[PDB]
Design a protein around this motif. Structure first.
Motif, PDB file in Angstrom:
ATOM      1  N   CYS A  30       0.927  -1.278   0.157  1.00  0.00           N
ATOM      2  CA  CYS A  30      -0.062  -0.077  -0.181  1.00  0.00           C
ATOM      3  C   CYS A  30       0.942   1.233  -0.045  1.00  0.00           C
ATOM      4  N   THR A  31       0.374   2.243  -0.911  1.00  0.00           N
ATOM      5  CA  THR A  31       1.312   3.651  -0.837  1.00  0.00           C
ATOM      6  C   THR A  31       1.087   4.266   0.352  1.00  0.00           C
ATOM      7  N   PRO A  85      -6.626   7.668   0.190  1.00  0.00           N
ATOM      8  CA  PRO A  85      -6.405   6.147   0.674  1.00  0.00           C
ATOM      9  C   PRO A  85      -5.252   5.815  -0.009  1.00  0.00           C
ATOM     10  N   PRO A  86      -4.589   4.679   0.771  1.00  0.00           N
ATOM     11  CA  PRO A  86      -3.487   4.159   0.323  1.00  0.00           C
ATOM     12  C   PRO A  86      -3.635   3.419  -0.844  1.00  0.00           C
ATOM     13  N   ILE A  87      -2.973   3.250  -1.956  1.00  0.00           N
ATOM     14  CA  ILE A  87      -3.144   2.346  -3.056  1.00  0.00           C
ATOM     15  C   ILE A  87      -2.500   1.019  -2.651  1.00  0.00           C
TER      16      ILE A  87
END
Length: 14
Positions: A3-4, A8-10
């Protein structure tokens, strides 16, 4: 899943 550092985290399947 990876997650990035964003919101919101990619989240990737890997």
């Amino acid at each position: 899943g990876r997650c990035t550092k964003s919101i919101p985290p990619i989240c990737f399947p890997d």
